[PDB]
Design a protein around this ligand. Structure first.
Ligand SMILES: Nc1nc2c(ncn2[C@@H]2O[C@H](COP(=O)(O)OP(=O)(O)OP(=O)(O)O)[C@@H](O)[C@H]2O)c(=O)[nH]1
Ligand SMILES: [Mg+2]
Lengths: 13, 165, 132, 415
């Protein structure tokens, strides 16, 4: 997994 | 440590007294088509018990435990005078084998709670147990729901198994 | 040769009969004619262990037609094994009851299958449904 | 309705056998490989072989023929999807699938082939749920086997609670020998790695065109989902109502959704080539490779294959970027370039020899098929938007995502 992640919003209401 | 059987004519109470020796219970039991096996650790000797039922179709199925066989228990049904003759013929059919000679005999006079039953000497007369060469035999009266006479048969069996103090 | 294996089978120790039944179904894997070893592996079946009884059920399945006359000696053990608190051995006995295709056997196998239909734990219910 | 699920060798003896019904005799397996040869040598290589009134369905793994016999009118796609799920379950247990496993792990595989099927019916085929009562190291079966939610056994706990999403593009393409696109489709697959505690619930946020049109925001950047086939975990009626992906996730690795759209944006890697096939002398490949996408991304480890004549000899490779190995195992060149920026053009000119005496049979013209892979970039335009964790406890999970552009069968035709 040498390609690194990014974080998404959880709620997005 | 030594193996044993419980064979004989059907509905003679042999699986009932078997599970009475196992747990101390009288549980619901169907007439036994296949077989039953349990183990009983009694006086530091595991009595490995192999029940084979007594239905008419499974009486020829007795030889397939008679390979490597050490002992025997033949449970009679005292209340059936009509079927004790064919039970005796089945017994002599079992006792006429070249392979079963190490097996000692242990006849349990079973279902000895009815007045129609015979005593522990008349069954010997009906079977002719005195004419048994090479057969260590011993008759004993056994009841299922009370449990009396079962451990006396186990005592005589344990005297037959060990040969020491 | 197979008399040695039947002697291992006619022992009293657990780790001898376990290797005996693994040797039997290893012969049956390549398809060695182990059909004469039927009437004594029926004896080493009513066991507390569970990884062993699947192998004995496998042997009874693969040689049911092979011994049409000797196969009567499993039915009391089926109606005993269909009465257990652990449901896995009951449903295993049920799904092995159905695959045994002998008409003399299926006469006595109806009422424990009926009892396993109305059972609580749905594993044996959906297994008995296929056994129907 | 299979009657015996078989695993054969590459010769015709039985690795493992498991019959259910008695409808197919066990001696009937012996005819499989002669019927295979006698139907294969005449153009009739079919997955459904025939022996009188006894059929033969089979799939082929590396060394294994998972043969599934039948005699009556078997439900066929049932049996084939059963066989592929048996392959996937065995690959979950045994990371390779050879004859070393089957003739030696036969302790547990007969129990597996007793568990998966009764009387021809697939009944319990999830791998993780099959693990917790079938081990190689036994209790009551888990209720998850009987319960409706049948892919997540409760009691799972991890210290952190991480959920990893992997969105995988896989461009399928088949450019004709003139220079035009025949088919530019994209088979995308979201594979998730879920490590959660308990029995959660996830609702995935996509930038769907359809959900935006039901909302009223179909004028921003969105993806046209032409078709989506979800996993069993997604409650499909809630997706049918208002495009809502509601699912109890499994534990660990699973495939979420298998979508398939079309896209008339240009091909990612363009392969112009010429072939000066002089008879009995030589051949020239003045192939060029340009990239149509933007000038910011980098294409990792591309493998531009070009099929060559079968018996060529003495290769020469004058390149500018990236190595060549000529691989005569499959009779192909492998033009590999590791770091491939966007919008640039890398030129390669090969030169072979060719035998004097012509062959007996012709050789065929297989297609160019590249093997690119790009991270942090999607050609589709799909972006995942939100992922709500629902839990009776209630906590902060960490949904992580990355964007992978791969190929599917990215073929381009030759002369
Ligand atoms: N009243 C009374 N009935 C008994 C007694 N012992 C046995 N029985 C009856 O005899 C029946 C015999 O039960 P089983 O032990 O299953 O019969 P079996 O001797 O094993 O014969 P198979 O099962 O066919 O091999 C029981 O159902 C009882 O009803 C007893 O001591 N007193
Ligand atoms: Mg009985």
């Amino acid at each position: 997994t040498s390609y690194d992640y990014c974080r998404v919003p959880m709620e997005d209401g | 440590e030594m193996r044993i059987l419980m064979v004989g004519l059907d509905a003679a109470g042999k699986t009932t007294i078997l599970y009475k020796l196992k747990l101390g219970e009288i549980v619901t039991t169907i007439p036994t088509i296949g077989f039953n096996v349990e183990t009983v650790e009694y006086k530091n000797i595991s009595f490995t018990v192999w029940d084979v039922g007594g239905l008419d179709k499974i009486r020829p199925l007795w030889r397939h435990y008679f390979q490597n066989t050490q002992g025997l228990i033949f449970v009679v049904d005292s209340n059936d005078r009509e079927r004790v003759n064919e039970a005796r013929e089945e017994l002599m059919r079992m006792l006429a084998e070249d392979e079963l000679r190490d097996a000692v005999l242990l006849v349990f006079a079973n279902k000895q709670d009815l007045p129609n039953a015979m005593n522990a000497a008349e069954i010997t007369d009906k079977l002719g147990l005195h004419s048994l060469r090479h057969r260590n035999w011993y008759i004993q009266a056994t009841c299922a729901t009370s449990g009396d006479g079962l451990y006396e048969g186990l005592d005589w069996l344990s005297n037959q198994l060990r040969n020491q103090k | 040769e197979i008399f040695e294996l039947k002697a291992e089978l006619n022992s009293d120790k657990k780790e001898k009969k376990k290797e005996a039944v693994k040797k039997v179904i290893a012969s049956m894997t390549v398809g060695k004619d182990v059909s004469a070893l039927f009437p004594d592996v029926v004896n080493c079946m009513q066991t507390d262990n569970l990884e062993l009884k699947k192998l004995v059920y496998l042997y009874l399945m693969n040689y049911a037609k092979s011994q049409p006359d000797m196969a009567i000696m499993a039915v009391n053990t089926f109606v005993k094994d269909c009465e257990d608190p652990n449901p896995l051995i009951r449903a295993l006995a049920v799904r092995t009851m159905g695959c045994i295709r002998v008409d003399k056997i299926t006469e006595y196998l109806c009422e424990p299958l009926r009892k396993c239909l109305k059972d609580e734990d749905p594993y044996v219910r959906k297994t008995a449904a296929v056994c129907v | 309705s299979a009657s015996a699920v078989y695993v054969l060798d590459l010769k015709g003896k039985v690795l493992i056998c498991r019959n259910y019904r008695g409808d197919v005799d066990m001696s009937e397996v012996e005819h499989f490989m002669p019927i295979l040869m006698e139907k294969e040598e005449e153009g009739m290589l079919s997955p459904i072989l025939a022996h009188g009134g006894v059929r033969f369905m089979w799939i082929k793994h590396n060394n294994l023929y998972l043969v599934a016999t039948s005699k009556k009118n078997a439900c066929v796609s049932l049996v084939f999807s059963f066989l592929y799920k048996v392959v996937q379950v065995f690959s979950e247990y045994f990371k390779e699938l050879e004859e070393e496993s089957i003739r030696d792990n036969f302790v547990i595989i007969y129990e597996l082939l007793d568990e998966l099927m009764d009387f021809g019916y697939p009944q319990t085929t999830d791998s993780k749920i099959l693990q917790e009562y079938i081990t190689q190291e036994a209790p009551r079966p888990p209720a998850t086997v009987t319960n409706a939610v049948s892919w997540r056994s409760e009691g799972i706990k991890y210290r952190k609670n991480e959920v990893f999403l992997d969105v995988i593009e896989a461009v399928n393409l088949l450019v004709s020998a003139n220079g035009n696109v025949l088919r530019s489709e994209i088979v995308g697959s979201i594979k998730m790695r879920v490590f959660l505690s308990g029995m959660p619930e996830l609702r995935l946020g996509l930038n769907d065109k359809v959900l935006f049109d039901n909302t009223g925001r179909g004028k921003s950047k969105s993806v046209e989902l032409e078709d989506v086939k979800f996993h069993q975990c997604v409650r499909l009626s809630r997706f049918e109502n208002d495009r809502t992906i509601s699912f109890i996730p499994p534990d660990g690795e699973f495939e979420l959704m298998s979508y398939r759209l079309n896209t008339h944006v240009k091909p990612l890697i363009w392969i112009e080539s010429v072939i000066e096939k002089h008879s009995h002398s030589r051949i020239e490949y003045m192939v060029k490779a340009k990239s149509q996408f933007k000038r910011r991304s980098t294409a990792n480890n591309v493998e531009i294959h070009i099929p060559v004549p079968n018996d060529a000899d003495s290769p020469k490779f004058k390149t500018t970027v990236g190595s060549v190995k000529w691989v005569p195992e499959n009779s192909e060149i492998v033009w590999s370039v590791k770091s491939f920026p966007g919008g640039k053009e890398y030129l390669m000119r090969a030169h072979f020899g060719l035998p004097s005496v012509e062959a007996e049979d012709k050789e065929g013209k297989p297609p160019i098929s590249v093997k690119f892979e790009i991270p942090y970039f999607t050609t589709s335009g799909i972006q995942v938007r939100y992922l709500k964790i629902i839990e009776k406890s209630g906590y902060q999970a960490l949904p992580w995502v990355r964007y992978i552009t791969q190929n599917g069968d990215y073929q381009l035709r030759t002369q």
